[PDB]
Amino acid sequence: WTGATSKADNQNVNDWERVVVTPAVDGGETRFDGQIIVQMENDAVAAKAAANLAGKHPESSVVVQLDSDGNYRVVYGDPSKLDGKIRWQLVGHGRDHSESNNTRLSGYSADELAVKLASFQQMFNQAEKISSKPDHISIVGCSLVSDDKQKGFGHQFINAMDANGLRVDVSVRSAKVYINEMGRKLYFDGKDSWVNKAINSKVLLSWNGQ
């Protein structure tokens, strides 16, 4: 399991596909007062997974599509309701690329991603006339990748974010997709198959401040 084999389509946000959000009928409870869900590539799995996350908390979630140039569009929700400390969820495919140890999320190394998000933080709040900053960032991979490469990117990302002026807690996990004809939520193996895993793994990194 080495994530998606395709090339990340992360350019020209205005040409991306949009998915309708449907309010989850058993949403649940959440810590956060609100959240921004950032879809980082034009991919059907990512677009749907992003919409599914927003569905869980339809009244307090904002879905944003964001390309490599820093351009974005709000495809769901009301950013004006975002205030204070919130959650970010990043949705895309993890990919291992040949000549390096590391992994990349929607085309970006952890450092490149941190630079773009720090820029997005500045631009988005000013454009939308709001005062918000992430308290926690959840990385939601749409392709199955091993536990260790998940942990590796997470550690790189949380340090890179801090070097760009944003100290946030970071979690990393793989998303499941409900497969209607199979009637089950399954993981995409990054290539051509759905995978049923009995056990889900999630790593949570947090600043101690000690």
From TrEMBL:
Q: Where in the cell is it found?
A: Host cell membrane; Host cytoplasm, Host cytosol; Secreted
This chain belongs to which protein, by name? MARTX
UniProt source species: Vibrio vulnificus
The record lists the lineage as:
Bacteria, Pseudomonadati, Pseudomonadota, Gammaproteobacteria, Vibrionales
